[PDB]
């Protein structure tokens, strides 16, 4: 007699996995023992950051009349902020381009 | 052999903030790299914090302190609130 299986992600109301993060923490050689509340916190933080990035990128994509998202939109979304530009200030994005700007002295 | 990624979860999260937007494969690779990078940073900082205080376990306090140390500005406040809410909801049941 066993109850119906319920994933920890559903129990915590998340979308990102919790068992996989727990396994990675155990097998990554980080500490001797791992508590029972660390995976939930880590999954929640990762999901929040992903949602932030995806929302900004989707706004950038919809700005110039497109349906899908390409790396250029991700680069625009990341570079046009102030906190995400500080968290990813030493990261290169393939096929991203640069932010368009020109110095005022060069302009006629 | 079979590989693992975060594709299905990224798609699930995307279908909640923009219900009519797709994504290409290159952007998915970039997203996977981003998730791996952030995971590694937070885990390493938590391990160092646990090692400094002569402990041998990683709890939610270490993760919270690592999050407050890494993320800048209001991102730290929001992430801390989300994590606390998730932990409370999980432990209520």
């Amino acid at each position: 007699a066993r109850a119906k299986a319920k994933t920890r992600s559903s129990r915590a109301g998340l979308q990102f996995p919790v068992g996989r993060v727990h396994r990675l923490l155990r097998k990554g050689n980080y500490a001797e023992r791992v508590g029972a509340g660390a995976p939930v916190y880590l999954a929640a933080v990762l999901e929040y950051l992903t949602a932030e990035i995806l929302e900004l990128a989707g706004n950038a994509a919809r700005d110039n009349k497109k349906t899908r998202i390409i790396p250029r939109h991700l680069q625009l979304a990341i570079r046009n902020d102030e906190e995400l530009n500080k968290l990813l200030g030493k990261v290169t994005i393939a096929q991203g381009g640069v932010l368009p700007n020109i110095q005022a002295v060069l302009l006629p | 052999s079979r590989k693992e990624s975060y594709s299905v979860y990224v798609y699930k999260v995307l279908k909640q903030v923009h219900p009519d937007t797709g994504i290409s494969s290159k952007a998915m690779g970039i997203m996977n790299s981003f998730v791996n990078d952030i995971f590694e940073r937070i885990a390493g900082e938590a391990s160092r914090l646990a090692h400094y205080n002569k402990r041998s376990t990683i709890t939610s306090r270490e993760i919270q302190t690592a999050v407050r140390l890494l993320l800048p500005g209001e991102l730290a406040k929001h992430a801390v609130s989300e994590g606390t809410k998730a932990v409370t909801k999980y432990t209520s049941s």
Binding site: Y48, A51, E52, E55 | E74, L75, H78, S81, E82
Partner: peptide, 4 residues
Amino acid sequence: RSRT
């Protein structure tokens, strides 16, 4: 920002 997004979700509080």
